[PDB]
Structure formats: structure tokens, C-alpha cells
């Protein structure tokens, strides 16, 4: 189930979720209608989680809906990554199109 | 912070609404019942559980009070619960009565005496206090064998001591010097 | 008092869940610190057992919660 943004101070964003659907530590969340990803850093209690944005906060507002992805930030791995330029989330930042990935791995281990 | 510093906005908001709608009596009963109910040992425990949401704490407290809360008083309990201040209810009721007492021009007075004082003497004391306080005084007489005679009056921070115990202390302080 | 028999009668129907003195519930999790509600009988320096075989130690016995 989805949560809602309740507070924004600098790069740190607080999101409130139903008490039976609170996301795990380091889980990746996606803001609806905006190209921004959040990584959960702490569970504050009362269904609230504190997170850091993986994109610019200029387009964010309080009350925006947030979706839990069920896993940590996952990036493409193996032979397909050679000769390519990528961002923190594993997206190609060169103009050579989508990466021919066959497997994805979580960044926390 | 002092509980009084946190309950002042809520007590003031409830008093202004109750005064503007002529509901001063109704809110004294609503706040009084919420204060009493919020302090019972099973409700005191339910209002501290980590799994209940603010809305469930408010709804539970509203269902227990039932008919002793009008629609405005229910909106007030939901506001106090959403702001996470349900522990202030006893202090909110206490501060609401202070605003109501000063609006009605009345004062509550505590009295302690060596022996039981008769109705004629209570009215004689009340008359004088009402004249200096320029308010309708309401005495609360009580017994204290510690005094050897006289009475001790207290109205807020004002304390008038006419007991012989106080006179014996003044005599001591004047001779010990 | 203000607690009428009706009010007293309604309070007895509340689903107030009893907490054993040796049990608690995790309230918040951050940077290796776990804050717990309950655990009324826990001693300073005692081991706490969590789900999945994880263990912690009680270091802050505060008035409203245990910091482990």
C-alpha cells in the first residue's frame, strides 16, 4: 500500500504509511507523477519513515503519494555494463539507449 | 515545558467558542467528563499503546463519553488527539474553569480553621472577601487541628493568615532576633 | 464522580490488551538502536530476544521506553 509525504527539509523527506505496510530499512520508494526515488534510512514509529532523495526536490510537495518497491536500490550487473556510463540508480547517462541487462543486484550487502 | 503552557491555547479556544455560542455550561460538563475518563487506569493504558492511530484513540475516547459530548466537543477531542496532546485534558478542563470563573466574576476560596465554623461566620467572611476581591466568592471550609485558633484564607496566590499559630510564629521571630 | 455507571459500563467493554512484564514491542529503528515499548521487568545490561534469532542489550531504561 502507498504512503504520503508529510515533511521536506533539505534533502531529507518524511513519508507516512499505513501501520501494517511500513517499508524496511534501505528499501527504495517511488514518488507518484515525479521522476524521484527515495531510500529509507530510519523508521521513526507511528507509521512514519525518514528517507533521502536520489533526485532534485524542486518538484516535490507535501501530500504526494509514494509507492514501496519491496526491495533495495537494484542496479544492472555483468558484461552489459562495460563501455557504458551510469548514474547512482544504474540508468544510462550516455546517449547509447537502454542497457542490455540480464540480472540486477541490490547495492547493500 | 509546564503543562499549563501547553494547555493554554486549547483551553482558550474551547472558552471562546463556548462563550460565542452561549454553551459555557455544556463545555464545563464535556471537558470535566473527558478529564475524569482520561485518568481511569484502563483508559490511561489504552491512550499509551504504540499500535493505535490518533484517530482510534480519539474515537475510543468519544465512544466512552457518548452523549456527554456535542458535535463541536467531538471536533475538539479529534483536534487534541491529532496534535498528540491527549495527556493535557485534565489541565485543559482546569484552565477552562479559570477563564469561565473570571468571565462570570466569581472566585473560589479555600478556608481552614481550628474548629467547625457556623454558616453566619462563613457568610461574614464571604461578605468581606467579596468586597476586597470585587468578585462573587465561593468558600470551601475545612478543619485543621494544627491551628490553636483563628482561620487561614487563600484565594489564588493571596493568603491571609489570622490563625493564632501564625501569631505565635511572629512572636517567636521577634524574640529569637 | 463524572464517571457515570454508563461511562463505567462502557469502559469495561474496551479491548485493552494486557502486556506481560517480560514482553515488549519495537517502536522505532535507527542506526543500530532499537526503542521498545513494554519490557517492565528488564534489567540494565540484560539480553533482549527479537524475531529471526537477533539479540540486543538493554542500555537506556527510560520512564516510557527501553533503548537497546
UniProtKB/Swiss-Prot annotation, chain A:
It comes from the Bacteria. It is found in: Cell inner membrane. Signal peptide: none annotated. Coiled coil: none annotated. Produces ATP from ADP in the presence of a proton gradient across the membrane. The catalytic sites are hosted primarily by the beta subunits. F-type ATPases have 2 components, CF(1) - the catalytic core - and CF(0) - the membrane proton channel. CF(1) has five subunits: alpha(3), beta(3), gamma(1), delta(1), epsilon(1). CF(0) has three main subunits: a(1), b(2) and c(9-12). The alpha and beta chains form an alternating ring which encloses part of the gamma chain. CF(1) is attached to CF(0) by a central stalk formed by the gamma and epsilon chains, while a peripheral stalk is formed by the delta and b chains. Belongs to the ATPase alpha/beta chains family. This is ATP synthase subunit beta. It comes from Pseudomonas paraeruginosa (strain DSM 24068 / PA7) (Pseudomonas aeruginosa (strain PA7)). The gene is atpD. The chain holds residues 2 to 110 of 458 of the full protein.
Curated annotation (Swiss-Prot), chain B:
Its main location: membrane. It comes from Pseudomonas paraeruginosa (strain DSM 24068 / PA7). It is a peripheral membrane protein. F(1)F(0) ATP synthase produces ATP from ADP in the presence of a proton or sodium gradient. F-type ATPases consist of two structural domains, F(1) containing the extramembraneous catalytic core and F(0) containing the membrane proton channel, linked together by a central stalk and a peripheral stalk. During catalysis, ATP synthesis in the catalytic domain of F(1) is coupled via a rotary mechanism of the central stalk subunits to proton translocation. This protein is part of the stalk that links CF(0) to CF(1). It either transmits conformational changes from CF(0) to CF(1) or is implicated in proton conduction. One of its GO terms (molecular function) is proton-transporting ATP synthase activity, rotational mechanism. InterPro entries: ATP_synth_OSCP/delta_N_sf, ATPase_OSCP/dsu. NCBIfam families: ATP_synt_delta, PRK05758.2-2. One of its GO terms (cellular component) is proton-transporting ATP synthase complex. Belongs to the ATPase delta chain family. F-type ATPases have 2 components, F(1) - the catalytic core - and F(0) - the membrane proton channel. F(1) has five subunits: alpha(3), beta(3), gamma(1), delta(1), epsilon(1). F(0) has three main subunits: a(1), b(2) and c(10-14). The alpha and beta chains form an alternating ring which encloses part of the gamma chain. F(1) is attached to F(0) by a central stalk formed by the gamma and epsilon chains, while a peripheral stalk is formed by the delta and b chains. This is ATP synthase subunit delta.
Swiss-Prot record, chain C:
It is found in: Cell inner membrane. F-type ATPases have 2 components, CF(1) - the catalytic core - and CF(0) - the membrane proton channel. CF(1) has five subunits: alpha(3), beta(3), gamma(1), delta(1), epsilon(1). CF(0) has three main subunits: a(1), b(2) and c(9-12). The alpha and beta chains form an alternating ring which encloses part of the gamma chain. CF(1) is attached to CF(0) by a central stalk formed by the gamma and epsilon chains, while a peripheral stalk is formed by the delta and b chains. Produces ATP from ADP in the presence of a proton gradient across the membrane. The alpha chain is a regulatory subunit. Belongs to the ATPase alpha/beta chains family. This is ATP synthase subunit alpha. It comes from Pseudomonas paraeruginosa (strain DSM 24068 / PA7) (Pseudomonas aeruginosa (strain PA7)). The lineage of its organism: Bacteria, Pseudomonadati, Pseudomonadota, Gammaproteobacteria, Pseudomonadales. The chain holds residues 7 to 74 of 514 of the full protein.
Amino acid at each position: 500500500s502507498s504512503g504520503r509525504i508529510v515533511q521536506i527539509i533539505g534533502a531529507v523527506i518524511d513519508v507516512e504509511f499505513p501501520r501494517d505496510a511500513v517499508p524496511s530499512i534501505y528499501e527504495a520508494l517511488k514518488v507518484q507523477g515525479v521522476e524521484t526515488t527515495l531510500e529509507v534510512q530510519q523508521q521513526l514509529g507511528d507509521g512514519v519513515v525518514r528517507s533521502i532523495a536520489m533526485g532534485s526536490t524542486e518538484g516535490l510537495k507535501r501530500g504526494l503519494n509514494v509507492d514501496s518497491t519491496g526491495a533495495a536500490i537494484s542496479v544492472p550487473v555483468g558484461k552489459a555494463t562495460l563501455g557504458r556510463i551510469m548514474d547512482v540508480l544504474g540508468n544510462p547517462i550516455d546517449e547509447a539507449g537502454p542497457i542490455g541487462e540480464e540480472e540486477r543486484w541490490g547495492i547493500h550487502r | 515545558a509546564e503543562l499549563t503552557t501547553l494547555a493554554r491555547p486549547y483551553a482558550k479556544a474551547a472558552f471562546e467558542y463556548a462563550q460565542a455560542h452561549q454553551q459555557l455550561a455544556d463545555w464545563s460538563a464535556a471537558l470535566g467528563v473527558l478529564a475524569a475518563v482520561s485518568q481511569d487506569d484502563t483508559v490511561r493504558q489504552l491512550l499509551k499503546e504504540p499500535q493505535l492511530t490518533s484517530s482510534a484513540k480519539a474515537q475510543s475516547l468519544i465512544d466512552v463519553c457518548g452523549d456527554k459530548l456535542n458535535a463541536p466537543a467531538q471536533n475538539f477531542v479529534r483536534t487534541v488527539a491529532e496534535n498528540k496532546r491527549l495527556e493535557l485534558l485534565p489541565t485543559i478542563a482546569e484552565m477552562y474553569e479559570q477563564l469561565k470563573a473570571e468571565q462570570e466574576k466569581s472566585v473560589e476560596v479555600e478556608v481552614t480553621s481550628a474548629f467547625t465554623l457556623s454558616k453566619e461566620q462563613q457568610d461574614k467572611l464571604a461578605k468581606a472577601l467579596s468586597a476586597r476581591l470585587s468578585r462573587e466568592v465561593r468558600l470551601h471550609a475545612s478543619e485543621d487541628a494544627s491551628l490553636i485558633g483563628g482561620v487561614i484564607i487563600r484565594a489564588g496566590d493571596l493568603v491571609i493568615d489570622g490563625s493564632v499559630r501564625g501569631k505565635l510564629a511572629k512572636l517567636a521571630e521577634a524574640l529569637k532576633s | 464522580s463524572e464517571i457515570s455507571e454508563i461511562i463505567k459500563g462502557r469502559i469495561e467493554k474496551l479491548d485493552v490488551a494486557s502486556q506481560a512484564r517480560n514482553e515488549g514491542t519495537i517502536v522505532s529503528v535507527s542506526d543500530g538502536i532499537v526503542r521498545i515499548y513494554g519490557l517492565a521487568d528488564v534489567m540494565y545490561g540484560e539480553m533482549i530476544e527479537f524475531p529471526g534469532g537477533v539479540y540486543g542489550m538493554a542500555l537506556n531504561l527510560e520512564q516510557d521506553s527501553v533503548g537497546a
